[PDB]
Design a protein around this ligand. Structure first.
Ligand SMILES: N=C(N)c1ccc2cc(C(=O)Nc3ccc(CN)cc3)ccc2c1
Length: 246
């Protein structure tokens, strides 16, 4: 997250921290995710497509720092890694950038909701917020495009949704951004999601309900003028999510 503020997991309890175990035992941070039900985390296929072995992943719920075993956190392995069959990547645009991780503890259990571990509601069909609405993003991603380390403490920020007509302007993304994608950015271009925030949530308060409107997917650079963050429009994928979690 470029700009924004530092936060803790009690303010983002649906946030899942996803790591990968390498041959030799080293563990590194991969992407964010969101808890949609006790056994299921939703994220972005681009985070996993190059290393599609479910046994390699470690998922934490209730974790506030990259390298601290936060009090109340829960550690899981991935029982099922479901990638969207029509996923693809263009130079900038990522298509069908959505994945599901069925989680299980070493005892064979799913998440136990608590003050620091909670689900996030899915949106309803054809009902996304209007352009100009403020939404929040969360993640352990880069603080500056030039950084190589990620921040130790979880971050969040707030951005505004941008219309499809505006996002398709020539100086924005033209025809590369589709109706299955949602743009969001800062009008002053000072805060945005960045590398390492992929798969994490774009949460919008809509009609009084905190909703998982988007999943961090792609963008040209980070916090660049006329280059919004681009998010998978979760409402389009409700049939796919329902069918793959039954
Ligand atoms: N401007 C944004 N909001 C934004 C939003 C998301 C971003 C994602 C990546 C990134 O590194 N993506 C990526 C894509 C595919 C693969 C798999 N090879 C790995 C990483 C890099 C920069 C990003 C910037």
């Amino acid at each position: 997250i470029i700009g924004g503020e530092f936060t803790t997991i009690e303010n983002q309890p649906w946030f899942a921290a996803i790591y990968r175990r390498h041959r030799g035992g080293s563990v590194t941070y991969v992407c964010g995710g969101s808890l949609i039900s006790p056994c299921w985390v939703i994220s972005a296929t681009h985070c996993f497509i190059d290393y599609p072995k479910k046994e390699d992943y470690i998922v934490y719920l209730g974790r506030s720092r990259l390298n601290s075993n936060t009090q109340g956190e829960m550690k899981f392995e991935v029982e099922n890694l479901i990638l969207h069959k029509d996923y693809s990547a263009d130079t900038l645009a990522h298509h069908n950038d959505i994945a599901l991780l069925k989680i299980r503890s070493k005892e064979g259990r799913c998440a136990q909701p608590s003050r620091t571990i909670q689900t996030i509601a899915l949106p309803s069909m054809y009902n996304d917020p209007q352009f100009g609405t403020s939404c929040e993003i969360t993640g352990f991603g880069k603080e500056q495009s030039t950084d190589y380390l990620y921040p130790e403490q979880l971050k969040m920020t707030v951005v505004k949704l941008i219309s499809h007509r505006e996002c398709q302007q020539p100086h924005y993304y033209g025809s590369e951004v589709t109706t299955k994608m949602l743009c969001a950015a800062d009008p002053q271009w000072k805060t945005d999601s960045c590398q390492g925030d992929s798969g994490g949530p774009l949460v919008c308060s809509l009609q009084g309900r905190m909703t998982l409107t988007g999943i961090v997917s792609w963008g040209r650079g980070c916090a660049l003028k006329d280059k919004p963050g681009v998010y998978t429009r979760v409402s389009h994928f409700l049939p796919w999510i329902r069918s793959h979690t039954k």
